[PDB]
């Protein structure tokens, strides 16, 4: 039931067969997303430190957030984008808590109850729970507590598909600078990079196909809450958006350092 996003023809995903047949959707407010990325970089330089050669969720045509949370509420896009960009920077001391406080104040002013759920998920660390806090806040979703255990267990497949794809597309630039799936497969099977890569692709397609099927069944049954279903359906655009973004995003392009 789409109100804020747009489906994009990107025929290379069919040839790549990593996202099953999940379409690419992109939030139409890419401009707000970039504004929140710029502000996060301005605050980081202001409070934390200088940034040189850093690239986060910005891609040449769309950003990470607009492809992966395509139905993100427009008035929440900047904040959601800022928080995603800040998590990218944090992953790569007084100012950090000052930036966090500001972000917390902006979130509480938008959605008090759902900022608390989100913060709870973000204190645990597990990257599952970061994306869980961000998506639920970005789309103003309230997962019934009786459904949470089941919803999170189901979403794990989409997190694995996107997580492994990420490592697949980040290994090259990461090696040039390992805690990557390609390296583990190169230990266990003692194989070359391209052979670990083909094994990784097999696993990605398993996880992706299982997720697509489960979400189809749950949607067809309509016995879970609309917010749980909306969260799970966002899991699908997170797989297609992650992959499409990975193709050309500066973060993983060797052309940068």
Residue numbers in the entry: 2 to 93, 124 to 156, 183 to 234, 243 to 322
What did the authors write?
In this study, two fungal chimeric class I TrTSs, Talaromyces verruculosus talaropentaene synthase (TvTS) and Macrophomina phaseolina macrophomene synthase (MpMS), were characterized. Both enzymes use dimethylallyl diphosphate and isopentenyl diphosphate or hexaprenyl diphosphate as substrates, representing the first examples, to our knowledge, of non-squalene-dependent triterpene biosynthesis. Structural analyses of the terpene cyclase domain of TvTS and full-length MpMS provide detailed insights into their catalytic mechanisms. In summary, a novel family of chimeric class I TrTSs converting HexPP into triterpenes was identified for which two subclasses can be distinguished.
Because recombinant full-length TvTS was insoluble, for in vitro assays the TvTS-PT and TvTS-TC domains were expressed individually. The structural basis of the cyclization mechanism was investigated by determination of the crystal structure of apo TvTS-TC by soaking with the non-reactive substrate surrogate 2,3-dihydro-HexPP. Although 2,3-dihydro-HexPP was not clearly observed and we cannot completely exclude the possibility that the observed electron density originated from polyethylene glycol (PEG) used in the crystallization buffer, the disordered regions in the apo structure, especially the DDXXD motif and the active site loop D173–D182, appeared clearly structured following soaking with the substrate surrogate. This observation suggests that a major conformational change occurs in TvTS following substrate binding that facilitates active site closure. The TvTS active site contains the conserved DDXXD and NSE motifs and other residues that interact with the substrate’s diphosphate. Aromatic residues in TvTS-TC (F65, F89, F187, W188 and W310) are observed in positions analogous to those in PaFS (F65, F89, F196, W197 and W319), while the PaFS residues at the bottom of the active site (M221, W225, M309, S312 and N316) are substituted with smaller residues in TvTS (A212, Y216, G300, G303 and S307). These differences create a larger pocket in TvTS-TC that is composed of a tunnel to accommodate two additional (non-reacting) isoprene units of HexPP, sticking out from a ball-shaped cavity in which the four reacting isoprene units are located. The high similarity between the AlphaFold2-predicted model and the crystal structure of TvTS-TC offers a basis for the discovery of additional chimeric fungal TrTSs through structural prediction, which is not possible from amino acid sequence analyses.
